[PDB]
Design a protein around this nucleic acid. Sequence first.
DNA 1: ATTGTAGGGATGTCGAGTCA
DNA 2: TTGACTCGACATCCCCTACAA
Lengths: 478, 54
Amino acid sequence: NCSSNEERKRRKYFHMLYLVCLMVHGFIRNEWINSKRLSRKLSNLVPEKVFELLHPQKDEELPLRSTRKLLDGLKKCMELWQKHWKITKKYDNEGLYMRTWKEIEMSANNKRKFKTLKRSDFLRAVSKGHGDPDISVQGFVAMLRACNVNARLIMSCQPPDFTNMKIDTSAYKDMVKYPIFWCEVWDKFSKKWITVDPVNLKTIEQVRLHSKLAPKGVACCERNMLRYVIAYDRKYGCRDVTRRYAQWMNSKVRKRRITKDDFGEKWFRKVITALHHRKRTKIDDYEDQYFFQRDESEGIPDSVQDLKNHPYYVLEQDIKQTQIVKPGCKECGYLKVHGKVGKVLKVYAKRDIADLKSARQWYMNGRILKTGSRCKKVIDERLYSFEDTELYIPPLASASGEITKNTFGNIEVFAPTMIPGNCCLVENPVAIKAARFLGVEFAPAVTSFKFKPVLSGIVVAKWLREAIETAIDGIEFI
Amino acid sequence: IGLTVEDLLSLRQVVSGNPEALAPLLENISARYPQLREHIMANPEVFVSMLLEA
DNA sequence: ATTGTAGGGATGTCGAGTCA
DNA sequence: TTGACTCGACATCCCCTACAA
């Protein structure tokens, strides 16, 4: 029922590629939204009274009353937009909802006929009031923006699911039940971003722990699996705002994002920075503060499956053999086990768990034991904490560039630290050939093991680097 | 990276105005540029910037 | 009398199925 | 309708004989 690691690896890759494209689409669309030609037309849709409602006066005794006025404005805008958008189309096909691996594979075959959508046509559409719900909302953001309110465009990116390993992977009303696009609006009085879905759910919410927009129910999550919710702002910001809309971000959603391993996170942040064309504002901080609060109000999940590979939390039973409880800590919570009577588990904070390694294991991380170290745990093998240890500084090479080697005539380099200070690592199949030809002093580098040493190159004095590299470059003439 | 002007054209245009049609284009283009894969894994921000210069 | 060559054990992950 | 638990099949990580020229 299950596919090859090749297909797995392809699906993960295609997922990243498809995502990056989607997020770029957001960026470009949000540009088209900021259009001045559009603004000038859209402003006159909004009465001055409504405009005044959208920019209430600072109220010192009760800012709430100002927020309240802003909310009233946003509702009047949603209504007059209901009237402006006359002809509301159907998506040609599945729109930007998630597609199944099968559908993708099969999309190669039939080259479905697609009317291209140029930039003019978008503006013209928004001005006529003719388009699908995605365009409709996008226009709505244009409108608010033309009124000089700070109004983000939100996009729930649905790349194909890269956690679906399956070979065989198996109507309209259930897909459109929740939106792909919507709007946020910044309340300077209450210092929070307000959520606005003027077309699908036609509501306005100040999200605390629950959002009307986050899809619920098996049917809605088939075509909409909420993982990457991106906010684009007037100033060509790009911020991952998923945490607002995902009630369980740290358990459920983390398993389904590329961000679950560390490589993923690094990749995702690279993409957001590529897409984030402004510099940090104070609002960014008000938001990040909200997100931290949310991340601290999520808490312990209600099931064992959601505590596998949880970022903050671990069951006493999932503590690895090589971990210990940090002295004077204890459970931060308990987990009632659904489906076993009376069965209870001790839940620890991962921040209270220490990782221990044996001497060799540390050496493979380039570390040796500090003076007067005690072991923290035993198995015949004593394990030690990271603070029991110290960098390994290998002896410097001589003037002639001799490297002190081991019994097998190599030097072990499993970490940059283990390159001597006056020496460098040169990794190259012929680096050994080179050094032998120049008859300069060097030493083979063991950089890792196969299960047998992997010799990936040479460790030579830095003064000799240029020379080796020349010999490497001229290896054909040796 | 190393792409034509006909593929970067189809990709800027699909990505910008017809993302519904992403699916078949990407199947194709990724099949003509093996290195694109490892590029996207190593250097996504590059692929972005490429798609932005418009 | 010899040169050339083929032939690691635990832990984790996801899908399905059974039980409650 | 769902989750806990189990199992399957992957996947990842941490030396010499026989023989012809």
